[PDB]
């Protein structure tokens, strides 16, 4: 009990008291406990010059007593004599408490955002940058960028990116670390916007960082600013990369914004690159030259001739594998099967005509003249409705006057049979374009008061308004749902008001609360697709609060199924955890939860080669219920996409299991529908193309997610199986040097030919028709060393890239 010396007046006994403290306090760490109140006499006295060290020893006894934030308060009142001396371990704890409290205080002041901010002591932030000198002097960028992410402030972080040496490109993948652990978009884009500016101030320009902000910051004026600087810079060759990343990985309105401010040689170039016509022609040539298909399986499914559910089966399966070939022999090889078609069968029959003709924007209209939507009036009229549906599947995303060609035919001929696939063609072609008149003429078209056309105008109005988050559109869609007696207009408007909101995160939760709280099961399922598309790409637990809650306590299995399917939409960025959390959830008593969860694991891990999802899907195809085996067949084809036998051993085991159950009449027709469907999935695009929901740049692909989420339930609407063609994206290595000119280039790949088998020294590839490639084989390949044409940009992924003449 040395603290009893403080009762005497003169301070020299206090300095001698703390001189006793700092030495023998090892055994006295607990002795000062009860007398800390007497230490407060020194801590509260300003005329005592050693009150600093009094707060040091008071912070030591509080360090032994377990007090942390209190030790931080006395660390602030401990003056200069505190921060100077660090020995034993007093440091890691107090700097953990200091940095923690500091970064959560900065986060506290960052939500204000401005004004009224709490006072920040200069000493606690003093030991921030002062102890950060350890990170600056030791030249450790990993920890330096770590604390730079903690402080949540742009000034000291601007000093971290300004540190010496290099760090040549390290800000790029550091933002990959940021966006991976990023919470909200508030300060994210604010930190991102200055990093592309410091890359413009850097001596070596790099377009992958401005590519990262183009797909992350996503603001309309910035792309017009950077490209106006490209035209001002007179950039041609190396801007080819970022320009195609703008077309590929950015929204349509983003393209409409950059072309709007730009147009106010290269003038025709920006038209060619933003329209993406050259990408369609090279994709067409890639699909016709490199097509690998097997007709034997199509014949074994042909001669089955089962009268139930097989109508859409074979045509949608071979329309997948053959997509974009334009060479179709199908109506020639199978005939009596197509003569069996009736009712919606001829819809899907002529709808596949557009799935296999996907792309080929020019001749797609006149080449179908034989299969054109007649309208010869021995009424098949679902026929002539599906013909315009086929023209809508090709004209999705960008388009042309064919959109008005379908619009006039919507105002002509009959009703409502034209609106079924016709308005779907009108809305799908205007998807993401924020078309105006379509919202009006679809309101007077919505008032024609029929049922099957309900899903027609609902999906159309939801596609044209995608990303617009409008007001009167959802107001009129929710206002028409009362007086109508149809449940298909409820489901079409369900996905309609779900599709209008995409990537809204918490902005849509105001409406999500009303949709989920309502007692209408169809409107609850509407809020499930709405909260899915709004939270797509984010793993935030605010969605899983109500999304998973209605997945628990609800009494309707269908909306519960759509609730557990959203795990594939929102969590697709982190597919690995889904098999673990949904493990038991596929053991549930009702097949609906086992089904939607099987679809969740299928679409989430589809872009990955994870064997765990295939392990959990093994008992799913063994379940006694039919459609849960069916969804197990479709999802198992989604996990194996483009993946051959060398990837997972279950490829051929499931391939033979598909033809087995469809050639076996004893099995259910429902469950066997997903078999031939799985043959279309796995073989889609002649194995050359697949579905990709996540681009390498880090931005989600809107038409693929929109394609698969409308493809979720094919039972209610059979033509929804055709919408999955939009989810198909080409995977290829394009050796185009520039413009129209096509160089001849072959480069080497280090993988064995067993990986190259698509049912060593160097690989043989185009030379751009490009050549197909596996995402796992893109890292092992190397640019040609001795060839005349060598890429200026480092080659990593596939697609179309610059090739420089050397």
């Amino acid at each position: 009990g040395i603290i009893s010396l403080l009762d005497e007046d003169e301070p020299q006994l206090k300095e001698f008291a703390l001189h006793k403290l700092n030495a023998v306090v090892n055994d006295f760490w607990a002795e000062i406990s009860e007398s800390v109140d007497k230490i407060e006499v020194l801590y509260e006295d300003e005329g005592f010059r050693s009150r600093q060290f009094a707060a040091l020893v008071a912070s030591k006894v509080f360090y032994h007593l377990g007090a942390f934030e209190e030790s931080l308060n006395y660390a602030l009142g401990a003056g200069d004599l505190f921060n100077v001396n660090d020995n034993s371990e007093y440091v890691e704890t107090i700097i953990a408490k200091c940095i923690d409290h500091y970064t959560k205080q900065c986060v506290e002041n960052a939500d204000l955002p401005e004004g009224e901010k709490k006072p920040i002591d200069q000493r606690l932030e003093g030991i921030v940058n002062k102890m950060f000198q350890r990170c600056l002097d030791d030249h450790k960028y990993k920890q330096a960028i770590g604390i730079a992410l903690e402080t949540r402030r742009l000034d000291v972080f601007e000093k971290t990116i300004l540190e010496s040496n290099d760090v040549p490109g390290m800000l790029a993948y550091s933002l990959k670390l940021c966006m991976s652990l990023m919470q909200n978009k508030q300060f994210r884009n604010k930190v991102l916007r200055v990093l592309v500016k410091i890359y413009m101030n850097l001596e070596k320009p790099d377009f992958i960082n401005v590519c990262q902000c183009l797909i992350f910051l996503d603001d309309p004026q910035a792309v017009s600013d950077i490209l106006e600087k490209l035209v001002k810079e007179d950039n041609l060759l190396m801007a080819y990369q970022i320009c195609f990343d703008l077309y590929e990985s950015a929204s349509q309105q983003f393209l409409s914004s950059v072309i709007q401010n730009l147009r106010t040689d290269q003038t025709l170039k920006m038209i060619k690159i933003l329209s993406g016509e050259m990408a369609i022609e090279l994709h067409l040539q890639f699909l016709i030259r490199n097509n690998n298909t097997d007709l034997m399986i199509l014949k074994n499914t042909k001669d089955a001739v089962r009268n139930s559910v097989c109508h859409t089966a074979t045509v949608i399966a071979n329309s997948f594998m053959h997509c974009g070939t334009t060479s179709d022999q199908f109506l020639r090889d199978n005939l009596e099967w197509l003569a069996r078609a009736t009712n919606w069968a001829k819809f899907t029959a002529t709808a596949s005509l557009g799935v296999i003709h996907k792309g080929h924007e020019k001749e797609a209209l006149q080449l179908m003249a034989t299969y054109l939507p007649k309208d010869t009036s021995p009424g098949s009229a679902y026929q002539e409705g599906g013909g315009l549906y086929a023209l809508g599947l090709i004209h999705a995303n960008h388009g042309g006057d064919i959109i008005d060609y379908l619009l006039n035919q919507l105002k002509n001929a009959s009703n409502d049979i034209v609106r079924h696939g016709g308005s779907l063609g009108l809305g799908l072609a205007a998807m993401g374009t924020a078309r105006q008149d379509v919202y009006d003429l679809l309101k007077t078209n919505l008032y024609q008061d029929d049922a099957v056309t309900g899903e027609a105008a609902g999906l159309a109005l939801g596609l044209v308004m995608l990303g617009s988050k409008n007001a009167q559109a959802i107001e009129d869609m929710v206002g028409y749902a009362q007086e109508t007696q149809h449940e298909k207009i409820l489901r079409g408007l369900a996905v309609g008001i779900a599709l209008v909101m995409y990537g809204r995160m918490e902005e849509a939760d105001a409406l999500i609360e009303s949709l989920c709280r309502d007692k209408d099961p169809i409107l609850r399922r509407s809020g499930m697709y709405t909260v899915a598309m709004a939270y797509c790409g984010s793993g935030n637990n605010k969605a899983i609060r109500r999304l998973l809650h209605v997945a628990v306590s609800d009494v309707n299995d269908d909306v519960r199924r759509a609730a557990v399917e959203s795990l594939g939409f929102i969590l697709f960025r982190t597919p690995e955890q889904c098999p673990s959390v949904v493990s038991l959830l596929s053991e549930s008593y009702n097949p609906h939860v086992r089904y939607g969860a099987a679809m969740a694991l299928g679409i989430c891990c589809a872009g990955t080669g994870n064997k765990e999802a295939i392990n959990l899907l093994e008992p799913m195809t063994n379940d006694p219920v039919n459609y849960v085996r069916q969804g197990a067949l479709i999802a198992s084809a989604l996990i194996m996409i483009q993946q051959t036998e060398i990837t997972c051993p279950k490829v051929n085991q499931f391939r033979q299991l598909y033809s087995k159950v469809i050639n076996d009449k004893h099995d259910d027709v429902m469950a066997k529908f997903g078999a031939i469907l799985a043959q279309g999935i796995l073989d889609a695009g002649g194995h050359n193309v697949t579905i990709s929901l996540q681009s390498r740049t880090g931005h989600t692909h809107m038409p693929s997610v929109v394609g698969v989420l409308v493809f979720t339930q094919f039972w209610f609407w059979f033509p929804l199986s055709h919408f999955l063609s939009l989810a198909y994206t080409p995977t290829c290595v394009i050796g185009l040097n520039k413009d129209l000119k096509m160089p001849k280039v072959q480069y080497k790949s280090n993988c064995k030919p067993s990986t190259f088998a698509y049912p060593t020294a160097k690989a043989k590839k185009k030379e751009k028709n490009p050549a197909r490639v596996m995402p796992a084989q893109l890292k092992v390949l190397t640019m040609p060393e001795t060839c005349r044409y060598q890429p200026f940009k480092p080659l990593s992924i596939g697609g179309i890239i610059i090739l420089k003449d050397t």
């Binding site: 090892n26 055994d27 760490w29 607990a30 002795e31 406990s33 009860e34 032994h64 007593l65 377990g66 034993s88 371990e89």
Partner: protein
Amino acid sequence: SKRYKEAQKISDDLMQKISTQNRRALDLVAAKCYYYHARVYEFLDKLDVVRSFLHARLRTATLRHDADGQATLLNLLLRNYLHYSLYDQAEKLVSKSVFPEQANNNEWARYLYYTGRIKAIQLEYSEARRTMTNALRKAPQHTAVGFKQTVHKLLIVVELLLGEIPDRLQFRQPSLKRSLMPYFLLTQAVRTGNLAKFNQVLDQFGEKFQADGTYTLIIRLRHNVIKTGVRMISLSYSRISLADIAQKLQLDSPEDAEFIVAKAIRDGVIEASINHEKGYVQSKEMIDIYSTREPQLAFHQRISFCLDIHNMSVKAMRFP
């Protein structure tokens, strides 16, 4: 080997990173040779230089590796700090924490014997009898050898200070018997209300009292003899004169006769009423109450919190 273990201690302060899954075995092995620190240092004198060194190791394990580390180091602290003054009674106050989880097994029971003597130095007999009983009852399986008999020895010390103790001659082992042989007649003198029987035990067995280390309570137990002596006779006798009871209460004058019973009610002993003239102590009793509320309402939280822990065990043991 202690210096090699100090190199193990510096590496116990560094790597980590990260999950030094071998530092739990380092907690095990080092706790052993930290007790070999105790033995080797005790070859000459106290280890006090290693008390600041133990506090250096015990505090540097905070908060990371304290798990199973802090428990053994706290016993290493408490054992010899119980042998050498001072302040450990108030030191373990601010040290806790608890410190959870209790590891390994009997380690927490023997800790509750060590701190049991500690919490017995505050003399509160409900917490002392529960920490001493829980110290012995929680320790399987032995052998060896006699210190598990020592916790039982000092266990009923606080029960002697309670005023009521059973005769323990039926609990004698072949070893513990020969060790406590003086303590036998001690607790036999505690059962009896005779003063000379207890004082002669003190004078004769004072040598064994030096061997055990418990002394100060032997002289104050005379107050337990006056309170148990008055609890005896009062409830015993119909109406007892203050002159007749003065033999066993050794004074019991006409004045203090009021306070003996009155200040026993302050301690909750006997309800005897006394009208003082000559006088005479007339002891009656009327009580019908209680035996109800706290036992059953606590049994609710007892059973429920138990089965909740048994849930936390079984639910978490299914990893295989």
